[model samples]
Target chain A: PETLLFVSTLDGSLHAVSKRTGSIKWTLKEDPVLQVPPAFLPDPNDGSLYTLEGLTKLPFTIPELVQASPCRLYMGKKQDIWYVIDLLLYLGRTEYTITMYDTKTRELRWNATYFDYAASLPEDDVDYKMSHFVSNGDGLVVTVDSESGDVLWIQNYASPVVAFYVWQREGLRKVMHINVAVETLRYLTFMSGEVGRITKWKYPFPKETEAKSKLTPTLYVGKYSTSLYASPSMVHEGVAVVYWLLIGHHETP
Target chain B: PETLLFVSTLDGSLHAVSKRTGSIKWTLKEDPVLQVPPAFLPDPNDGSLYTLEGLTKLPFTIPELVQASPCRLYMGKKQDIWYVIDLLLYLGRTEYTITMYDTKTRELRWNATYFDYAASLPEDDVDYKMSHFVSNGDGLVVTVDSESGDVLWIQNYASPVVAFYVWQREGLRKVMHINVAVETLRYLTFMSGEVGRITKWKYPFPKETEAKSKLTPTLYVGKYSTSLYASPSMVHEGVAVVYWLLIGHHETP
Candidate 1:
């Protein structure tokens, strides 16, 4: 039911514990510097003893060491090169960047940078955090093959410091909701949230003046088919019914 | 004895279990995107919940999409900031790089590349693999702490592939060992076994060219004083002895 993978902390020691039993299988310590996590790769030929650490370039250094983000082992489309996401960091200034590396030849492919300043404002502030990488069908974001980087898609979303209501939407979906506090706008905006279409309520809202205010929800058109409905509330954010009829999905013009 | 720590994998699912029992404590899958290893920062003052991110900047791009290595949490010099080492692959590489992050502010501190190239017959072959991190009071090497990046007093060393032996001399004065397939050059100059050292053997020994010629060493030095020998071939390497001239101890440069 479980496989124990040994991982190291910043102190650079590997501890083997059963993911199921949580028993200390073993503890392996190397040099006296903090180490990052271990990468397990399956050997192509025999598929035994996963190929660990296929392509290493430099020794680990300081300032930006290792984070606990997961990386995918991928093969490039153009050449027979393997690619892997190295590290992810939120630069202090404005950019959220992800780095990549070539596993086969020990070279760098490309660096994808995303800047979403909408979540950092006073009225429409939002905290956009990167969750993971999705390869649609092709390769990474920077591949140039038919079925190459095309499969790769990145998901960036928002997390409020404190949300009256928060819902994790499906892929590339838009949501509408009524937040209780107006100050919530200070830390609220969609990271990947696209303001699709704006629709006025069928009947006049309770607080006509307040609903039209900047803090209230203004409808938007979706780039693709999506569901829409009035948000339940903070207590039941992720738990709600979809209103398919009221929403319209739009394609890129 | 053990404690349960919640962890989410590349699948972007939350899991909880008994640290000791390894039983499923709970499972939460609110966000199913690529999820980095979650940091569990229990407030020291009152034991509150704090999910922190952004430790150090990596060498490549699309970093966030890559699943971060399991996060290893550590307390930093500052009370508010928690440190974690991230072992993750960069964008298109096979080598696993180590990074560090400041959990409180979600800002990257620093990052260092990890790769070792072997001298092929004609060209340099890049080996993208990371073993582990270790820290002794000899200036640790990490990709964290940019301002005071290099911890001069604490040195960090990582094993190439396998460890032959390990021991401490002078009653925990210095830890030493000889790693498998590793060769020592001069007293401090160490290289892979592909080449032999200039220092000849003290006694007139047989010309064991085949025995001595290899990229890796069969026997190597573990510790210098008080002698902790890490040898792979105990038989061929012969026996090593540590002789103390005086019981109380005497020093000779």
Candidate 2:
């Protein structure tokens, strides 16, 4: 049998459709907003299909902020078992939380609130109005045990983060590359396995160039600003390359 | 035999590595900035490999006003030869130029300066800062002869263009769909292969809704604004659907 097409609607509904006949097989609706895509996991042991949905619970009063908030999904395996991870934002308290789900039974496995004070940038500023923030300096990138939902390690940064990427290497070493907007642009690395540590690197921009001036403010606008598009980092031969926009204007001289 | 990975570096270097062995096969370096990905071209006649690189040249001083610049790449073929197109902004003149490269010889075939003025939205305003400007009324979308680099035709528009898409159907009849940000959002079409004409359509927004108030400004911010993420137009079952976000906020009545 062919795979089905899974898609989400703006009104917070998920639909799985038969690809050949274009007929709906099943539909799931719960959250008030389902802007992000849902994650699909297939159990290797039993060949059962499981879907993980990360919800953005925006207030019905403020519909303009719907796109500003997003949730992510991740999957991990431990000892021949598969687990689902959901990273979400709490609307009123502005906190980031991680939850794990059991795929087969569709039951909650564990939940942990990782960070707080996750206020977005000001709505009136020209440079920051379009940006989204779930956490400021108090935000944390965390790792949890896939089986038990116990917190493994957490790292905090000085400024709000724009984007991040996760990679698993030999021996199940979890590595993360984060792009943060401080006074300027900074890239940070966190490793959680046998040795857990955090390392930060400043993005190299010329002192008098216009790129350095815009890096921080453009990041405040985050996805809304074309001046700061950050691509996921690619690693090869022990060297990792991170690509981001460093646009500059012309000088009169 | 296994395929190799080909990637480019920020400092304008290209590398090819064996995927199975993780060994470097060869490297190429030239430009000072290779922010965009390289385009790979394989010869249909002799099966030789060629790569095209696009560069962003920044002045050594003054770290402000990066919005006035952009660079893009396009490739096409005519008769039996292939060509690479590069669209870039000039350093001091604030103009957009198009240059063509011969894939076989790796030499500049021809160059044309297309747009002038090309001023960005004013810095202090919230409505305009997030927008991108490729043409300021005098800009043109053109096609060139791939073998000899001859200009085929040029078309101009009324307002600054935010984004445009091109489609070819039924005997190379070229059709273009362009989104122009004027006082409101306008969608225009151009047909140039055998039947040459241009048509304009205004985006249908409720006259009294807050969406009309935000359409122009939201388009100026282009992709960053949640109100305007452009997806490639999809055609299926003799129907064409173009998906874009037209978000609106509630006004307290």
Candidate 3:
């Protein structure tokens, strides 16, 4: 048998009494000053009904607000809103987005990007909203149309900058430091012999004598121990050679 | 056959000239400055070396710092200090922490506390080093030893204030908010039925009725919709039972 529920208007008293005998079964106290009518929704999957509070604050307002069940609920102190979702489609007042989920793997069958960092927006526009989601489905996934479930077109992609190491050679020792806005490989060389495609450009010493101008460049792989010093001069007589290497987009090698 | 090596000074001045002339050739640069001396270690497995620089600015002043192979180096800009880590130990100035490393696996062995997070110190305090290390090892691993490594005996932990959700029931409608502190929670919910408890307790109404009294014994839970629209009567009827679960160090479930 279908159950009928009755409530009091003055005190919000809920009475679930037998219709025939007028015998009371259950009574729920509802403060008339505080309690208002709620919204209701029918679940699409099981058809179960759900309820939520009204949006308006006034009790006598003619345009009374109501919400239904099978909906996503969010409560805020200042202003609150309601949304409904069924299957992979979400519906809000005048707007909606569709989502596709892999039934077998339970994964979203789409491409998405994740952000590791964020920056603040300009203060000029009050209505401007912060970029929280990427079109790649990493954050909030919005669809263009619910009927077609077409993926929303992305406007732009965010790029992240990272720092890398650079080595500088002074005499025989190299110092490690960070470079800014730079994208080139750099290294020091002490090999007196010619190395891969590299030729002797000029010598700071005497240019007349063959002994002074000679460039017998050899590969520099300095001694493991000597490299510890702040500025270790490359070994001239030993087989060890020390050089810097920098590989970038434009390769000269 | 021998090689002639040329050395340059930091001021872009030529300083030393060495050849196969002397077994241990010496080339001197400017005053108190020579070709950054080469570091020499007899055994490769014994220990590592690192250069120590001043605490003032970048490109720190290190005359002849020698760092052994297999050591890690990090420069702290804020603290103006340098950190050096060898195979199984870390050293800075007169303070050195001996670490145990597995010889075969080349991984840290046993308990090892390398360095702590950087912190600022008062100007008047002595030994005003701003850098220290906190390790995740067991037992006492840190102490206030100036020259020797000491185990720290005390651990400091702090408890933060609890957080709660603020919700209000007006007529049949429910409003939700957030309360950061208990005082704020009580102040906001003074007349409203939004208590710190998980369930919503009905506020005292002016009119008295047996049916209304029954709902008083029961609590209410506020649910919201994505758009946040619902009526008061619906909110009162939709209020659900909520259970409060508290898990802490002192209690077992």
True contacts kept of each: 0.00, 0.00, 0.00
Sorted by TM-score (best first), the order is 1, 2, 3
Candidate number that wins on TM-score, 2 or 3: 2
Predicted model with the maximum lDDT: 2
**TM-score of model 2 vs. true structure:** 0.16
lDDT of 3: 0.18
Here the TM-score of candidate 2's chain B is: 0.20
Deviation of model 3 at A239, angstroms: 32
lDDT of 3 at A45: 12
Per-residue lDDT of A121-149 in model 3, one digit per residue for the tens? 12323222111111110111111122232
Q: Give candidate 2 misplaced runs (Cα > 4 Å).
A: A1-134, A146-148, A167-253, B1-253
Q: In angstroms, how far off is A47's CA in candidate 1?
A: 29
- Model 2's CAPRI class? incorrect
For each candidate, the DockQ is: 0.01, 0.01, 0.01
| CAPRI band for model 3 | incorrect
Clashes of each: 129, 10, 69
Tens-digit lDDT string for candidate 1 (B69-156): 2233111110011112122212111222334555566654533222111111121113211111121111121111112221111122
